[PDB]
Design a protein around this ligand. Structure first.
Ligand code: HEM
Length: 152
């Protein structure tokens, strides 16, 4: 990614930082709406029946915030995130068993929510930059997955 692309990424990310809990719950609800098979991975969401019950569950809100916290830390490294990605690939490949396609799904949800809340700060060029950052994240995770013997 160019420095200009990183700056567009970190510019919209600063808007997520103004309300992490809120962005977090929206992204998870969008993920589950769009790709209900993913809900199975979340023991603290999967028995909840409505958006409103999810938005009100402290423990369902938790992976929403966890995701954004970790992804925030990774994006701020602007590509130099081996120390953050190694452990994330370890857990998601060997314990949680998250296929790369589920990482595409969550990327789609992030993009959707950012555009929904911040259309003024998230036009074509910013969406392009964010897509590149998340593609890089997925490409790097994927290679770590294979190193660990997970072909997901
Ligand atoms: C944006 C990409 C993602 C990031 C940055 C991310 C980050 C994290 C982090 C930091 C944790 C806690 C520590 C760990 O176990 O490694 C975690 C846990 C977990 N993640 Fe992810 N994750 C992502 C995508 C996903 C997806 C797509 C799923 C499944 C649909 C998933 C399922 C889980 C599960 C089941 C846990 C354990 C429960 C929990 O601690 O919340 N993750 N994730």
């Amino acid at each position: 990614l160019s420095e200009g692309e990183w700056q567009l990424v970190l510019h919209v990310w600063a808007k997520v930082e103004a309300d992490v809990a809120g962005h977090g719950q929206d992204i998870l609800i969008r993920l589950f709406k769009s790709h209900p098979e993913t809900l199975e991975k979340f023991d603290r969401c999967k028995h909840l029946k409505t958006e409103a019950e999810m938005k009100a569950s402290e423990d369902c809100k938790k992976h929403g915030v966890t995701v954004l916290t970790a992804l925030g830390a990774i994006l701020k490294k602007k590509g130099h995130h081996e120390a953050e990605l190694k452990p994330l690939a370890q857990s998601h490949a060997t314990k949680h068993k998250i296929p790369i396609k589920y990482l595409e799904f969550i990327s789609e949800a992030i993009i959707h929510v950012l555009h929904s809340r911040h259309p003024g700060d998230f036009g074509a060029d910013a969406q392009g930059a964010m897509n590149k950052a998340l593609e890089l994240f997925r490409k790097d995770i994927a290679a770590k997955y294979k190193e660990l013997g997970y072909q997901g």
